[PDB]
């Protein structure tokens, strides 16, 4: 697929807001011509599917101003300082929900916005959980809930799990639970 | 309860393609925070199912991530048109197909932390193969993929595009009679 590649002729950071950083590149496309590409520079993230002994999964409810709504999500956060994402996932599970896990399994890496961000999210399965306490960050508001996976899958079908990272977790979990993928 | 209340709004950036909104909001702690996110018109993605049971997919380079992706065809809403019109036009332009049977599946939000983007996913059936009509700076190859192969590619980490991976899973439930 080499003949679809675009070659970067220049890059600059075009904007830095309070949170978002934008890179503007000029690229040479397969027609030999020059096009502008803009995208967000993102450190990456981790998300985890925390499977409780009773077979429910620990999830959160969190308001997302970008969309003006509350979402049901699996816990997640940004990579800090180029850390291994396993450390991200561990830290975020403890902070957002109060849990630790003895068994961590990497499932897959996803890209949520290939059109305009370099973000990748590493998705983990966390098992053999024990509870401590929630440690929420400044400006983070999050209610923790337990969800039966069968109810989750029905929520997906019904359009109530629109958060792509979480919906994808749900489908991988479904695969794991029916024993098709391990 | 969890809702944040908008106190002020500003469009802080508009480049060649991206537009960023910056809001001051009041959160449940009563405190003021900044929220910044891309303003995106919305998009449609199309799962085009062929009489032979394969699906039409595309390879496209994505500079944000610096590699070529396997994707279902997709594009952005033009002028707040109905996303089914977006879907019909992009399927024609990206792949050269038209479909006489369209079904909305679901709406996904690919980046709830920093974009208002939504993508509406559709199933397209009863197809006729015309020719592509690509936009400028748009370079795309069309491939047929067997859904069983597509699911193995998902397992292997080779369909990392969230919208397409989600399409694959919905196709799987449909094809298995589950949904
Ligand atoms: N980040 C970008 N920077 C510069 N130009 C872009 C970018 N993304 C797209 N373009 C250009 O703008 C046009 C609009 O593209 P569409 O087909 O409407 O949308 P596409 O880029 O396919 O994305 C639609 C959807 O797919 C998703 O994975 C993507 O994140 C978006 O949600 C194209 O001709 C393309 O060359
Ligand atoms: N658009 C935004 N504007 C301002 N502040 C933000 C924004 N998004 C997040 N924050 C805040 O900055 C901190 C960064 O949190 P993250 O570790 O990014 O947690 P989250 O926002 O969940 O991001 C993890 C991931 O989840 C995805 O769905 C999301 O799009 C991102 O990839 C949090 O305290 C959060 O409240």
Author numbering:
A (entry chain A): 1 to 182
B (entry chain B): 3 to 181
What sentences appear in the manuscript?
Not surprisingly, substrate binding involves elements from both monomers. In fact, 46% of the buried ADPR surface in each active site is from the opposite monomer. Adenosine recognition involves hydrogen bonding by the E38’ (prime denotes a residue of the other monomer) main chain amide nitrogen and carbonyl oxygen to the adenosyl N1 and N6 respectively. R37’ and Y19 flank the nucleoside base though stacking interactions on opposite sides. As in Ec-NDPSase, Ec-ADPRase, and Mt-ADPRase, R64 of Bd-NDPSase forms a bidentate hydrogen bond through the guanidinium side chain with the β-phosphate oxygens O1β and O2β. In addition to nucleoside and phosphate recognition, Bd-NDPSase forms a network of hydrogen bonding interactions involving the three hydroxyl groups of the distal ribose. G115’ tethers both ends of an ADPR horseshoe conformation by hydrogen bonding to the hydroxyl at ribose C2 through its main chain amide nitrogen as well as to adenosine through the amide oxygen. The carboxylate of E119 makes a hydrogen bond with the hydroxyl at C3 and positions a water molecule to make a hydrogen bond to the hydroxyl on C2. The most distinguishing amino acid residues are K165 and D163, which form a bridge between the hydroxyl at C1 and the hydroxyl at the Cβ of T166. Interestingly, this network of interactions is also present in Ec-NDPSase, but not in Ec-ADPRase, suggesting that these residues may indeed be responsible for differentiation between GDPM and ADPR.
Of particular interest is the Bdellovibrio bacteriovorus HD100 nucleoside diphosphate sugar (NDPS) hydrolase Bd3179 because it appears to have some of the characteristics of the Escherichia coli adenosine diphosphate ribose (ADPR) hydrolase and the guanosine diphosphate mannose (GDPM) hydrolase. Bd-NDPSase is a homodimer whose monomers are related by a non-crystallographic 2-fold axis. Each monomer comprises an N-terminal and a Nudix domain. Phosphate release assays revealed that among the nucleoside diphosphate sugars hydrolyzed by Bd-NDPSase, its highest relative activity was with GDPM.
